[PDB]
């Protein structure tokens, strides 16, 4: 496939518009507090990192639902580590908004962390992708 | 690939609903069994009373922790529900979702389906 210049087609482009920052929680935070962080920052996702900066996993509103479905009130006390998804799929600065959609559709998740040089460098969400395919 | 009617022919006309007295905890149980992110709140008569998602679940537990699971779905749901029609387009949908900052738009004087941001996306590929 082949693309033109400044049509918001690449991950690098989306980052320039929205921002490079990522909100994170540590692994020993409880489920109930991860949810409180979701709400104060108005986001659907938080990346789980350790003392040293390693990505451990990813927790979203959808993990919240599964947790309470299965174990009710008690699950708010449990550590974010038992509900989070450990195998985290990523993209690169040069990934395209087309690939991204196919990853999100096929894998059935809505958040993709951006990597470069083994580093965490931002996060792209389905709502970013969608806005890009309109805003001009 | 581009009307609401087209999307419903591919995915289905059905909608998953709960009553208003169901607790937030049980609402959450329904979301998981059906693998969906939202559930439309209707009365004994069939009228749409609001919409409740995984996002309202987050706001509830953030504010009042374990006790919120006991509360009725009615105090956490969004009462003012925006909708689309059989002949709404893919484009318009995207702007409604982006501007309003939500991800589900019920199809309509009767309820006749529901469209989510994931549907719209898969249709554009
Ligand atoms: N009006 C706008 O500019 C935007 C509107 N939306 C709408 O908001 C609703 C919810 O959005 P979703 O994309 O489903 O995602 P979301 O609500 O999880 O994310 C919202 C924004 O926060 C960012 N974000 C998510 N997790 C983050 C983290 N850990 N650290 C830093 N930033 C993070 C995402 O990039 C996204 O731009 C949707 O209906 C969508 O259409 C989403 C993005 C932008
Ligand atoms: N493979 C496929 O055909 C689809 C894949 N997806 C992917 O799944 C993940 C979550 O999808 P979202 O679009 O955020 O929404 P969602 O998880 O709320 O929707 C999943 C499916 O359920 C439907 N749905 C939701 N609430 C319903 C209700 N009350 N009654 C009847 N049907 C209902 C939606 O139309 C969609 O087909 C995303 O990561 C997305 O990329 C989403 C839809 C279809
Ligand atoms: N990058 C990712 N890799 C694998 N699973 C993910 C990723 N992001 C989210 N998920 C999972 O997909 C499910 C629904 O995610 P979401 O659409 O991201 O709320 C949750 O279990 C998430 O943990
Ligand atoms: N079609 C809609 N019209 C109005 N509000 C909605 C609609 N869909 C969801 N909401 C609400 O907006 C927020 C985001 O929902 P969602 O992105 O669908 O998980 C939640 O507080 C919902 O109660």
Tab-separated table of C-alpha atoms and ligand atoms in Angstrom:
chain	number	residue	atom	x	y	z
A	1	UNK	CA	0.000	0.000	0.000
A	2	UNK	CA	1.218	3.682	-0.487
A	3	UNK	CA	0.290	7.055	1.271
A	4	UNK	CA	0.490	10.902	0.905
A	5	UNK	CA	1.960	13.570	3.230
A	6	UNK	CA	0.021	15.201	6.078
A	7	UNK	CA	-3.225	13.232	5.872
A	8	UNK	CA	-2.761	11.838	9.382
A	9	UNK	CA	-1.874	8.324	8.193
A	10	UNK	CA	0.954	7.368	10.570
A	11	UNK	CA	1.213	6.863	14.338
A	12	UNK	CA	3.879	9.642	14.511
A	13	UNK	CA	1.248	12.087	13.121
A	14	UNK	CA	-1.438	11.262	15.672
A	15	UNK	CA	1.069	11.670	18.491
A	16	UNK	CA	1.957	15.170	17.268
A	17	UNK	CA	-1.690	16.212	17.493
A	18	UNK	CA	-2.787	14.598	20.793
A	19	UNK	CA	0.392	14.124	22.927
A	20	UNK	CA	3.160	11.724	23.857
A	21	UNK	CA	2.316	11.188	27.531
A	22	UNK	CA	1.137	7.918	29.097
A	23	UNK	CA	-0.823	7.520	32.330
A	24	UNK	CA	0.359	4.661	34.458
A	25	UNK	CA	-0.303	2.808	37.748
A	26	UNK	CA	2.071	0.408	39.717
A	27	UNK	CA	1.175	-3.321	40.179
A	28	UNK	CA	0.189	-3.255	43.850
A	29	UNK	CA	-2.494	-0.618	43.506
A	30	UNK	CA	-5.932	-2.245	43.930
A	31	UNK	CA	-8.622	-2.592	41.204
A	32	UNK	CA	-10.770	-0.037	42.981
A	33	UNK	CA	-8.000	2.559	42.854
A	34	UNK	CA	-7.118	1.842	39.206
A	35	UNK	CA	-10.739	2.671	38.467
A	36	UNK	CA	-10.374	5.968	40.396
A	37	UNK	CA	-7.383	6.829	38.179
A	38	UNK	CA	-9.396	5.968	35.019
A	39	UNK	CA	-11.981	8.527	36.152
A	40	UNK	CA	-9.869	11.500	37.323
A	41	UNK	CA	-7.860	11.379	34.009
A	42	UNK	CA	-11.031	10.683	31.871
A	43	UNK	CA	-9.387	7.722	30.125
A	44	UNK	CA	-10.335	4.082	29.470
A	45	UNK	CA	-6.938	2.491	30.014
A	46	UNK	CA	-3.874	2.541	32.249
A	47	UNK	CA	-0.541	0.822	31.642
A	48	UNK	CA	0.893	-1.250	34.517
A	49	UNK	CA	4.603	-0.477	35.094
A	50	UNK	CA	7.086	-1.623	37.847
A	51	UNK	CA	9.616	0.293	39.955
A	52	UNK	CA	12.120	0.093	37.077
A	53	UNK	CA	9.922	1.156	34.172
A	54	UNK	CA	9.088	-2.289	32.690
A	55	UNK	CA	5.625	-2.689	31.148
A	56	UNK	CA	3.865	-5.447	33.049
A	57	UNK	CA	0.439	-5.254	31.443
A	58	UNK	CA	-2.599	-3.169	30.681
A	59	UNK	CA	-5.903	-2.684	32.576
A	60	UNK	CA	-9.054	-1.188	30.934
A	61	UNK	CA	-12.691	-0.539	31.840
A	62	UNK	CA	-13.407	-3.921	30.200
A	63	UNK	CA	-11.241	-5.752	32.764
A	64	UNK	CA	-13.244	-3.857	35.454
A	65	UNK	CA	-16.513	-5.384	34.170
A	66	UNK	CA	-15.078	-8.992	34.016
A	67	UNK	CA	-13.731	-8.616	37.606
A	68	UNK	CA	-16.967	-7.552	39.207
A	69	UNK	CA	-18.991	-10.062	37.084
A	70	UNK	CA	-16.945	-12.897	38.515
A	71	UNK	CA	-16.170	-11.814	42.125
A	72	UNK	CA	-18.385	-8.837	43.035
A	73	UNK	CA	-17.467	-6.450	45.850
A	74	UNK	CA	-14.307	-8.465	46.863
A	75	UNK	CA	-12.579	-7.846	43.573
A	76	UNK	CA	-12.111	-4.090	44.295
A	77	UNK	CA	-9.636	-5.148	47.062
A	78	UNK	CA	-7.617	-7.394	44.737
A	79	UNK	CA	-4.434	-6.170	43.120
A	80	UNK	CA	-4.618	-4.783	39.591
A	81	UNK	CA	-2.121	-7.596	38.577
A	82	UNK	CA	-4.705	-10.401	38.759
A	83	UNK	CA	-7.089	-8.823	36.278
A	84	UNK	CA	-4.693	-7.092	33.838
A	85	UNK	CA	-3.707	-8.439	30.432
A	86	UNK	CA	0.022	-9.428	30.541
A	87	UNK	CA	0.652	-9.990	26.804
A	88	UNK	CA	0.582	-6.469	25.507
A	89	UNK	CA	0.400	-5.902	21.655
A	90	UNK	CA	2.208	-2.652	20.421
A	91	UNK	CA	2.812	-0.477	17.340
A	92	UNK	CA	5.665	1.734	15.965
A	93	UNK	CA	6.004	5.400	14.913
A	94	UNK	CA	5.611	4.318	11.344
A	95	UNK	CA	2.632	2.025	11.781
A	96	UNK	CA	-0.385	3.220	9.770
A	97	UNK	CA	-3.925	3.979	10.825
A	98	UNK	CA	-5.041	1.130	8.437
A	99	UNK	CA	-2.970	-1.538	10.191
A	100	UNK	CA	-4.005	-0.167	13.514
A	101	UNK	CA	-7.737	-0.718	12.680
A	102	UNK	CA	-7.058	-4.283	11.638
A	103	UNK	CA	-5.125	-5.015	14.848
A	104	UNK	CA	-7.982	-3.490	16.950
A	105	UNK	CA	-10.683	-5.347	15.064
A	106	UNK	CA	-8.916	-8.775	14.969
A	107	UNK	CA	-7.512	-8.794	18.514
A	108	UNK	CA	-10.788	-7.207	19.918
A	109	UNK	CA	-9.204	-4.469	21.983
A	110	UNK	CA	-9.164	-0.650	21.602
A	111	UNK	CA	-5.800	0.497	22.976
A	112	UNK	CA	-2.360	0.110	21.431
A	113	UNK	CA	0.828	1.263	23.308
A	114	UNK	CA	3.541	2.793	21.055
A	115	UNK	CA	7.137	1.408	21.171
A	116	UNK	CA	10.481	2.613	19.757
A	117	UNK	CA	13.905	1.472	20.829
A	118	UNK	CA	12.269	-0.852	23.366
A	119	UNK	CA	10.867	2.241	25.026
A	120	UNK	CA	7.261	3.190	25.827
A	121	UNK	CA	6.570	6.382	23.787
A	122	UNK	CA	2.843	6.944	23.738
A	123	UNK	CA	-0.584	5.386	23.391
A	124	UNK	CA	-3.110	5.270	20.532
A	125	UNK	CA	-6.819	4.616	21.102
A	126	UNK	CA	-9.716	3.679	18.744
A	127	UNK	CA	-11.171	7.237	19.221
A	128	UNK	CA	-7.861	8.783	17.996
A	129	UNK	CA	-7.923	6.545	14.889
A	130	UNK	CA	-11.572	7.522	14.217
A	131	UNK	CA	-11.130	11.297	14.688
A	132	UNK	CA	-8.131	11.086	12.301
A	133	UNK	CA	-10.249	9.561	9.551
A	134	UNK	CA	-12.427	12.651	9.650
A	135	UNK	CA	-10.722	16.062	10.845
A	136	UNK	CA	-9.812	17.031	7.124
B	1	UNK	CA	-20.859	-0.006	3.093
B	2	UNK	CA	-22.175	3.295	4.461
B	3	UNK	CA	-25.791	3.473	5.879
B	4	UNK	CA	-26.972	2.390	9.290
B	5	UNK	CA	-29.396	-0.018	7.581
B	6	UNK	CA	-26.385	-1.725	5.906
B	7	UNK	CA	-24.591	-2.228	9.175
B	8	UNK	CA	-27.608	-3.847	10.845
B	9	UNK	CA	-28.015	-6.304	7.948
B	10	UNK	CA	-24.479	-7.543	8.673
B	11	UNK	CA	-24.480	-7.617	12.445
B	12	UNK	CA	-28.133	-7.988	13.559
B	13	UNK	CA	-31.195	-6.058	14.735
B	14	UNK	CA	-31.299	-7.341	18.294
B	15	UNK	CA	-30.715	-5.231	21.400
B	16	UNK	CA	-29.709	-6.394	24.905
B	17	UNK	CA	-31.766	-4.520	27.647
B	18	UNK	CA	-32.191	-4.370	31.405
B	19	UNK	CA	-34.997	-3.011	33.623
B	20	UNK	CA	-34.422	0.033	35.920
B	21	UNK	CA	-34.439	-1.748	39.319
B	22	UNK	CA	-31.626	-4.130	38.444
B	23	UNK	CA	-28.525	-3.260	40.495
B	24	UNK	CA	-25.355	-1.865	38.991
B	25	UNK	CA	-23.550	-5.049	40.050
B	26	UNK	CA	-26.053	-7.159	38.056
B	27	UNK	CA	-25.962	-4.747	35.119
B	28	UNK	CA	-22.198	-5.485	35.056
B	29	UNK	CA	-22.942	-9.233	35.074
B	30	UNK	CA	-25.109	-8.796	31.956
B	31	UNK	CA	-22.387	-6.874	30.105
B	32	UNK	CA	-20.012	-9.728	30.650
B	33	UNK	CA	-22.271	-12.754	29.722
B	34	UNK	CA	-23.179	-11.060	26.358
B	35	UNK	CA	-19.667	-9.718	25.776
B	36	UNK	CA	-20.873	-6.143	25.233
B	37	UNK	CA	-20.014	-2.674	26.530
B	38	UNK	CA	-23.503	-1.244	26.932
B	39	UNK	CA	-27.016	-2.073	27.879
B	40	UNK	CA	-30.160	-0.033	27.177
B	41	UNK	CA	-32.495	0.675	30.136
B	42	UNK	CA	-36.206	0.243	29.418
B	43	UNK	CA	-39.406	0.116	31.523
B	44	UNK	CA	-42.147	-2.517	31.783
B	45	UNK	CA	-43.852	-0.740	28.816
B	46	UNK	CA	-40.857	-0.675	26.492
B	47	UNK	CA	-39.821	2.970	26.643
B	48	UNK	CA	-36.146	3.934	26.630
B	49	UNK	CA	-35.176	5.337	29.986
B	50	UNK	CA	-31.410	5.623	29.517
B	51	UNK	CA	-28.127	3.979	28.669
B	52	UNK	CA	-25.551	2.402	30.930
B	53	UNK	CA	-21.947	1.397	29.863
B	54	UNK	CA	-18.620	0.198	31.257
B	55	UNK	CA	-17.784	3.920	31.532
B	56	UNK	CA	-20.600	4.666	34.031
B	57	UNK	CA	-19.323	1.555	35.969
B	58	UNK	CA	-15.878	3.235	36.414
B	59	UNK	CA	-17.434	6.572	37.581
B	60	UNK	CA	-19.617	4.749	40.191
B	61	UNK	CA	-16.873	2.756	41.804
B	62	UNK	CA	-14.483	5.708	41.748
B	63	UNK	CA	-17.022	7.829	43.653
B	64	UNK	CA	-18.572	5.369	46.162
B	65	UNK	CA	-16.625	2.095	46.032
B	66	UNK	CA	-18.238	-1.244	47.035
B	67	UNK	CA	-21.598	0.293	48.037
B	68	UNK	CA	-22.243	1.417	44.456
B	69	UNK	CA	-22.822	-2.207	43.279
B	70	UNK	CA	-25.928	-2.231	45.488
B	71	UNK	CA	-27.397	0.914	43.954
B	72	UNK	CA	-29.944	0.922	41.195
B	73	UNK	CA	-28.753	1.231	37.577
B	74	UNK	CA	-31.048	4.320	37.409
B	75	UNK	CA	-28.852	6.634	39.451
B	76	UNK	CA	-25.725	6.006	37.256
B	77	UNK	CA	-27.238	5.809	33.761
B	78	UNK	CA	-27.349	8.614	31.210
B	79	UNK	CA	-31.051	9.650	30.811
B	80	UNK	CA	-30.580	11.863	27.704
B	81	UNK	CA	-29.840	9.302	25.017
B	82	UNK	CA	-28.915	10.493	21.480
B	83	UNK	CA	-29.894	8.309	18.519
B	84	UNK	CA	-29.544	7.673	14.779
B	85	UNK	CA	-31.868	6.482	11.978
B	86	UNK	CA	-31.852	3.757	9.278
B	87	UNK	CA	-30.501	6.249	6.696
B	88	UNK	CA	-27.829	7.954	8.881
B	89	UNK	CA	-24.358	7.520	7.457
B	90	UNK	CA	-21.021	6.141	8.646
B	91	UNK	CA	-19.592	9.703	8.369
B	92	UNK	CA	-22.246	11.359	10.476
B	93	UNK	CA	-21.976	8.609	13.097
B	94	UNK	CA	-18.221	9.299	13.546
B	95	UNK	CA	-18.905	12.962	14.172
B	96	UNK	CA	-21.690	12.287	16.710
B	97	UNK	CA	-19.357	9.847	18.589
B	98	UNK	CA	-16.386	12.185	18.520
B	99	UNK	CA	-18.245	15.358	19.493
B	100	UNK	CA	-20.423	13.760	22.149
B	101	UNK	CA	-17.600	11.575	23.500
B	102	UNK	CA	-19.529	8.266	23.609
B	103	UNK	CA	-19.383	5.004	21.706
B	104	UNK	CA	-22.879	3.597	21.281
B	105	UNK	CA	-25.815	5.069	19.416
B	106	UNK	CA	-29.220	3.394	19.591
B	107	UNK	CA	-31.206	3.237	16.323
B	108	UNK	CA	-34.772	4.653	16.089
B	109	UNK	CA	-40.525	6.147	17.463
B	110	UNK	CA	-39.290	2.655	18.223
B	111	UNK	CA	-35.968	1.092	19.208
B	112	UNK	CA	-34.756	-1.036	16.302
B	113	UNK	CA	-31.021	-1.779	16.876
B	114	UNK	CA	-27.742	-0.427	18.168
B	115	UNK	CA	-24.519	0.675	16.532
B	116	UNK	CA	-21.093	0.827	18.214
B	117	UNK	CA	-17.783	2.471	17.319
B	118	UNK	CA	-16.373	-1.072	16.596
B	119	UNK	CA	-19.046	-1.660	13.911
B	120	UNK	CA	-18.339	1.661	12.223
B	121	UNK	CA	-14.574	0.835	12.235
B	122	UNK	CA	-14.867	-2.685	10.838
B	123	UNK	CA	-17.161	-1.306	8.101
B	124	UNK	CA	-14.480	1.188	6.963
B	125	UNK	CA	-12.054	-1.722	6.335
C	1	LIG	N1	-13.042	14.504	20.759
C	1	LIG	C1	-11.819	13.957	20.735
C	1	LIG	O1	-10.800	14.617	20.462
C	1	LIG	C2	-11.705	12.495	21.125
C	1	LIG	C3	-12.891	11.814	21.473
C	1	LIG	N2	-12.843	10.525	21.865
C	1	LIG	C4	-14.097	9.916	22.175
C	1	LIG	O2	-14.088	9.607	23.596
C	1	LIG	C5	-14.757	8.339	23.777
C	1	LIG	C6	-13.834	7.387	24.528
C	1	LIG	O3	-12.606	7.342	23.789
C	1	LIG	P1	-11.726	6.046	23.406
C	1	LIG	O4	-10.873	6.273	22.210
C	1	LIG	O5	-12.658	4.874	23.301
C	1	LIG	O6	-10.521	6.007	24.505
C	1	LIG	P2	-10.334	6.597	25.987
C	1	LIG	O7	-11.470	7.337	26.572
C	1	LIG	O8	-9.599	5.470	26.693
C	1	LIG	O9	-9.176	7.617	25.640
C	1	LIG	C7	-9.425	9.044	25.547
C	1	LIG	C8	-8.137	9.729	25.180
C	1	LIG	O10	-7.138	9.500	26.165
C	1	LIG	C9	-6.030	8.827	25.635
C	1	LIG	N3	-5.517	7.818	26.584
C	1	LIG	C10	-6.069	6.625	26.868
C	1	LIG	N4	-5.299	5.971	27.770
C	1	LIG	C11	-4.269	6.750	28.086
C	1	LIG	C12	-3.115	6.662	28.992
C	1	LIG	N5	-2.938	5.555	29.752
C	1	LIG	N6	-2.239	7.696	29.048
C	1	LIG	C13	-2.428	8.784	28.288
C	1	LIG	N7	-3.483	8.914	27.472
C	1	LIG	C14	-4.413	7.954	27.316
C	1	LIG	C15	-6.482	8.224	24.355
C	1	LIG	O11	-5.454	8.579	23.491
C	1	LIG	C16	-7.633	9.071	23.937
C	1	LIG	O12	-7.146	10.179	23.154
C	1	LIG	C17	-15.067	7.780	22.355
C	1	LIG	O13	-16.447	7.949	22.003
C	1	LIG	C18	-14.266	8.615	21.361
C	1	LIG	O14	-14.895	8.727	20.066
C	1	LIG	C19	-11.670	9.809	21.928
C	1	LIG	C20	-10.446	10.464	21.575
C	1	LIG	C21	-10.462	11.825	21.186
C	2	LIG	N1	-15.079	-8.451	14.974
C	2	LIG	C1	-16.189	-7.711	14.910
C	2	LIG	O1	-17.101	-7.902	14.060
C	2	LIG	C2	-16.287	-6.594	15.947
C	2	LIG	C3	-15.154	-6.204	16.717
C	2	LIG	N2	-15.194	-5.201	17.634
C	2	LIG	C4	-14.006	-4.869	18.483
C	2	LIG	O2	-14.434	-5.184	19.820
C	2	LIG	C5	-14.014	-4.286	20.829
C	2	LIG	C6	-15.151	-3.586	21.558
C	2	LIG	O3	-16.102	-3.105	20.615
C	2	LIG	P1	-16.892	-1.681	20.640
C	2	LIG	O4	-17.071	-1.300	19.185
C	2	LIG	O5	-16.178	-0.775	21.572
C	2	LIG	O6	-18.340	-1.936	21.349
C	2	LIG	P2	-18.951	-3.201	22.230
C	2	LIG	O7	-17.874	-4.092	22.862
C	2	LIG	O8	-20.003	-2.460	23.047
C	2	LIG	O9	-19.640	-3.969	20.999
C	2	LIG	C7	-19.255	-5.282	20.625
C	2	LIG	C8	-20.419	-5.704	19.736
C	2	LIG	O10	-21.646	-5.729	20.480
C	2	LIG	C9	-22.645	-4.844	19.946
C	2	LIG	N3	-23.451	-4.340	21.092
C	2	LIG	C10	-23.021	-3.558	22.111
C	2	LIG	N4	-23.997	-3.346	23.053
C	2	LIG	C11	-25.105	-4.018	22.654
C	2	LIG	C12	-26.496	-4.217	23.150
C	2	LIG	N5	-26.953	-3.643	24.304
C	2	LIG	N6	-27.330	-4.990	22.431
C	2	LIG	C13	-26.946	-5.570	21.288
C	2	LIG	N7	-25.730	-5.405	20.763
C	2	LIG	C14	-24.750	-4.671	21.378
C	2	LIG	C15	-21.878	-3.855	19.126
C	2	LIG	O11	-22.755	-3.604	18.052
C	2	LIG	C16	-20.707	-4.703	18.626
C	2	LIG	O12	-21.108	-5.502	17.505
C	2	LIG	C17	-13.272	-3.238	20.075
C	2	LIG	O13	-11.875	-3.389	20.409
C	2	LIG	C18	-13.607	-3.411	18.604
C	2	LIG	O14	-12.465	-3.040	17.848
C	2	LIG	C19	-16.374	-4.582	17.827
C	2	LIG	C20	-17.527	-4.929	17.091
C	2	LIG	C21	-17.511	-5.938	16.128
C	3	LIG	N1	-2.471	-3.656	23.742
C	3	LIG	C1	-3.259	-4.674	24.150
C	3	LIG	N2	-2.928	-5.968	23.985
C	3	LIG	C2	-3.707	-7.010	24.410
C	3	LIG	N3	-4.877	-6.872	25.025
C	3	LIG	C3	-5.325	-5.597	25.230
C	3	LIG	C4	-4.531	-4.414	24.806
C	3	LIG	N4	-5.169	-3.312	25.138
C	3	LIG	C5	-6.332	-3.771	25.717
C	3	LIG	N5	-6.426	-5.127	25.783
C	3	LIG	C6	-7.463	-5.998	26.369
C	3	LIG	O1	-8.664	-6.086	25.642
C	3	LIG	C7	-9.787	-6.139	26.505
C	3	LIG	C8	-10.758	-4.997	26.163
C	3	LIG	O2	-9.907	-3.845	25.968
C	3	LIG	P1	-10.294	-2.347	25.527
C	3	LIG	O3	-11.057	-2.282	24.209
C	3	LIG	O4	-8.877	-1.954	25.351
C	3	LIG	O5	-10.982	-1.840	26.742
C	3	LIG	C9	-9.181	-5.976	27.895
C	3	LIG	O6	-8.880	-7.204	28.550
C	3	LIG	C10	-7.853	-5.385	27.647
C	3	LIG	O7	-6.992	-5.832	28.657
C	4	LIG	N1	-25.894	7.253	22.501
C	4	LIG	C1	-25.638	7.923	23.645
C	4	LIG	N2	-26.252	9.130	23.925
C	4	LIG	C2	-25.924	9.749	25.097
C	4	LIG	N3	-25.034	9.285	26.032
C	4	LIG	C3	-24.372	8.090	25.858
C	4	LIG	C4	-24.654	7.305	24.616
C	4	LIG	N4	-23.903	6.204	24.673
C	4	LIG	C5	-23.202	6.279	25.853
C	4	LIG	N5	-23.480	7.384	26.559
C	4	LIG	C6	-22.945	7.832	27.873
C	4	LIG	O1	-21.673	8.499	27.668
C	4	LIG	C7	-20.568	7.890	28.388
C	4	LIG	C8	-19.525	7.127	27.502
C	4	LIG	O2	-20.087	5.883	27.050
C	4	LIG	P1	-19.399	4.838	26.048
C	4	LIG	O3	-18.273	5.583	25.312
C	4	LIG	O4	-20.525	4.386	25.180
C	4	LIG	O5	-18.931	3.703	26.967
C	4	LIG	C9	-21.301	7.027	29.413
C	4	LIG	O6	-21.507	7.851	30.569
C	4	LIG	C10	-22.692	6.691	28.847
C	4	LIG	O7	-23.695	6.619	29.906
